[PDB]
């Protein structure tokens, strides 16, 4: 499993469950073409987005629908979403985990890369 | 000053100076309309981007050229840039301080609203 | 001002006002020597804690009474209080801004050094 | 396993491996008594710190030696450690995961509490 996203609710101290996640890859021109999508599970994790065969080198965009997450709890948050754009597998295939920590008025998204 | 953007360097622990920041506002037709842009000062802050009259209710995108920042420090980052999209003034005028803390593999952002 | 502490509320997106802050410095015998204290203002900032003459090299602890802050807001937090411990001025005097962002279950802290 | 700590290096984008972690519990007096300790694995996680029987109600402090971590990588750190003090099991037994994200000049620690 080369790409996984883990989302945590730092305000309620719990996993961010059922959060929509969309992944895109930049095509040769300059457009973002749909690559994969899914929703986080009860543990706040999202596995199986793609495979080693499909996940080639490229610039990828991971957009987390944090707004719907907060609205469902009755909160109108600051951000429309949490997004990370990064280059993947530029020095060979790696396993990537996008770890996102959420709060209504702030968030962090970091790319954890392993061999 | 209703909108101020601050950028910090998580690796060196200093203000990220001379960083390019672009701000866009989403139009009725769903497109991104250029709003204002500038570069952070020695304190890592960007003031004067807009006015109270100009900064109406809406969805705004702040795009930081984090990549050029790292390049100039001799670093080749994994993150391509940093983008923060937020809804502003939907409950009346407010002053916003949008801060972004950078690292080659991560960014954190905060919004202080008063 | 060589040391400034700023506290923010990640739940409401505002400065955390009237937050108690206590600073200690580790003594030669390993005990925490009271150094300075105060409360955040309406901007969530606390200035004037110390001076260039008193702020010597050493290991400092900034203890933030997050608990009392939440209580006043009708919230019984799981986090008891934040402790930010750092070494200061070990390569000469520097100006430090210690910021802490709070939630009932978490806190993030940053340090800008100039 | 009621208490787990996971540490991530948000600056190098990897798990923070072999990081020492010390856990204390405030005793009836007002002092921090040793409770448990360990080192993070290659995944940056530390399991088996305590048991359901031993982890009773109380105020606990979890101190992560980030200073040694950054030095071993040749990176000068700002903080002595990343820490979290919290009341645990005050409303019955819970599972606690301390998620800490690290950078030389900043850290975040959030208690993820589940049933």
Swiss-Prot record, chains A, D:
Impact after mutating residue 115 to S: In AMYLD1; uncertain significance
Outcome reported for the amino acid change (mutating residue 107 to S): In AMYLD1; amyloid polyneuropathy
Cellular compartment(s): Secreted; Cytoplasm
Highest rank taxon of the organism: Eukaryota
Binding site for L-thyroxine: 6, 45, 108
PTM info: Not glycosylated under normal conditions. Following unfolding, caused for example by variant AMYLD1 'Gly-38', the cryptic Asn-89 site is exposed and glycosylated by STT3B-containing OST complex, leading to its degradation by the ER-associated degradation (ERAD) pathway. Sulfonation of the reactive cysteine Cys-1 enhances the stability of the native conformation of TTR, avoiding misassembly of the protein leading to amyloid formation.
Implicated disorder: Amyloidosis, hereditary systemic 1: A form of hereditary systemic amyloidosis, a disorder characterized by amyloid deposition in multiple tissues resulting in a wide clinical spectrum. AMYLD1 is an autosomal dominant form due to transthyretin amyloid deposition. Protein fibrils can form in different tissues leading to amyloid polyneuropathies, amyloidotic cardiomyopathy, carpal tunnel syndrome, systemic senile amyloidosis. The disease includes leptomeningeal amyloidosis that is characterized by primary involvement of the central nervous system.
Family label: Belongs to the transthyretin family.
Note: Tetramer dissociation and partial unfolding leads to the formation of aggregates and amyloid fibrils. Small molecules that occupy at least one of the thyroid hormone binding sites stabilize the tetramer, and thereby stabilize the native state and protect against misfolding and the formation of amyloid fibrils.
UniProt-recorded name of the protein: Transthyretin
Name of the gene encoding the protein in the UniProt record: TTR
Full protein segment contained here: 30 to 144 of 147
């Amino acid at each position: 499993c080369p790409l996984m996203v883990k989302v945590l609710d730092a305000v309620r101290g719990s996993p961010a469950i059922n959060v929509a996640v969309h992944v895109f890859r930049k095509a040769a021109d300059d457009t973002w073409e749909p690559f994969a999508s899914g929703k986080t599970s009860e543990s706040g994790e999202l596995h199986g987005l793609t495979t080693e065969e499909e996940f080639v080198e490229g610039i990828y965009k991971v957009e987390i629908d944090t707004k719907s997450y907060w609205k469902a709890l009755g909160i109108s948050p600051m951000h429309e979403h949490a997004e990370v754009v990064f280059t993947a597998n530029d020095s060979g295939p790696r396993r990537y985990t996008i770890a996102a920590m959420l709060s209504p008025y702030s968030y962090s998204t970091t790319a954890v890369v392993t061999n």
